[PDB]
């Protein structure tokens, strides 16, 4: 079926929970053996969210190459993304090592450091120009260059320096600050505006390494972001935009990381975002 009318048909019939459970039933299951080794227990935020072995990002280190991060490679859309958990106190150095080694330009953050009274990820970037961060385990330096605070999101320019080689690079930090503590946004308008700002920067483009995107577990809000981007790109590329089947795209993405889209509300919101975004394109 088309998307907008399949949408109303699920609303009127109130079957979002049944649709979403079908997806969960059909989703791929692959091994995640490296993630479950005992030496990696303090590298995982949640015991039920692990990267598949076939698609995990490997650190270029011979001691322990493990990080909780996955490469989602979308062949027809010609887009790649790295989805990862919010960094932990003992993995902030691994996180920036990954950014460096994969040649990423941008980092997309869809959570706040504290939500619901608890810490959802480490304070992994510097908050003042004159107070830079050094990560001694991976030999990197990180400096805040500038910050632009808007009503729904903040953009930061950062400098990352490989202290071994003295090479430097500019990284863009796109921080969506207004997702609600419970549920999903009422309108997709500010989320879509945010996505367009990430696109306009060049961070999603083939001349760079894949964008790194995260929330707390790296599957829910993060899944919404890449599912919406990929679906809109396919609607531009294809002769028949109504042929784009969001459930099929989501199942393709779940071949690369488990659990993408965590609730039926997030699924409905993803439909809404793609339906509204397609118009604005023309």
Swiss-Prot record:
Entry superkingdom: Eukaryota
Cross-link for N,N-(cysteine-1,S-diyl)serine (Cys-Ser), residue positions: 215-216
Catalytic-site annotation from UniProt: 215
Modification type Cysteine sulfinic acid (-SO2H): residues: 215
Top-tier EC class: hydrolase
Membrane topology: Peripheral membrane protein
Phosphoserine found at: 50, 242-243
GO cellular component, one term: glutamatergic synapse
Keyword Transferase set for record: no
The reaction(s) this protein catalyses: O-phospho-L-tyrosyl-[protein] + H2O = L-tyrosyl-[protein] + phosphate
Residue numbers carrying Cysteine persulfide: 215
Record PTM text: Oxidized on Cys-215; the Cys-SOH formed in response to redox signaling reacts with the alpha-amido of the following residue to form a sulfenamide cross-link, triggering a conformational change that inhibits substrate binding and activity. The active site can be restored by reduction. Ser-50 is the major site of phosphorylation as compared to Ser-242 and Ser-243. Activated by phosphorylation at Ser-50.
Summary of the function given for this chain in its UniProt record: Tyrosine-protein phosphatase which acts as a regulator of endoplasmic reticulum unfolded protein response. Mediates dephosphorylation of EIF2AK3/PERK; inactivating the protein kinase activity of EIF2AK3/PERK. May play an important role in CKII- and p60c-src-induced signal transduction cascades. May regulate the EFNA5-EPHA3 signaling pathway which modulates cell reorganization and cell-cell repulsion. May also regulate the hepatocyte growth factor receptor signaling pathway through dephosphorylation of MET.
Protein name in UniProt: Tyrosine-protein phosphatase non-receptor type 1
Organism: Homo sapiens
């Amino acid at each position: 079926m088309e998307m907008e009318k399949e949408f109303e048909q699920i609303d009127k019939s109130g079957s979002w929970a049944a649709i979403y459970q079908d997806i969960r039933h059909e989703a791929s299951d692959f091994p995640s053996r490296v993630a479950k080794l005992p030496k990696n227990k303090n590298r995982n935020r949640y015991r039920d969210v692990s990267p598949f072995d076939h698609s995990r990002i490997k650190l270029h280190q011979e001691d322990n190459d493990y990080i909780n991060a996955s490469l989602i490679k979308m062949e027809e859309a010609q887009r790649s993304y790295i989805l990862t958990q919010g960094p932990l106190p003992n993995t902030v150095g691994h996180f920036w090592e990954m950014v460096w080694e994969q040649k990423s330009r941008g980092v997309v953050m869809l959570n706040r450091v504290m939500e619901k009274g608890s810490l959802k990820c480490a304070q992994y970037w510097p908050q003042k120009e004159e107070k830079e961060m050094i990560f001694e385990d991976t030999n990197l330096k990180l400096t805040l260059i500038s910050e632009d605070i808007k009503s729904y999101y903040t953009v930061r320019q950062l400098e990352l320096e490989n202290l071994t080689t003295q090479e430097t690079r500019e990284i863009l930090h796109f921080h969506y600050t207004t997702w609600p503590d419970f549920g999903v946004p009422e309108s997709p308008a500010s989320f879509l505006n945010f996505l367009f700002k990430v696109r306009e920067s060049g961070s999603l483009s083939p001349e760079h390494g894949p964008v790194v995107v995260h929330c707390s577990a790296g599957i829910g809000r993060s899944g919404t972001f890449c599912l919406a981007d990929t679906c809109l790109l396919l609607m531009d590329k294809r002769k028949d935009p109504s042929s784009v089947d969001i459930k099929k795209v989501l199942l393709e993405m779940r071949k690369f990381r488990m659990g993408l889209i965590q609730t039926a509300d997030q699924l409905r919101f993803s439909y809404l975002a793609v339906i509204e975004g397609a118009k604005f394109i023309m």
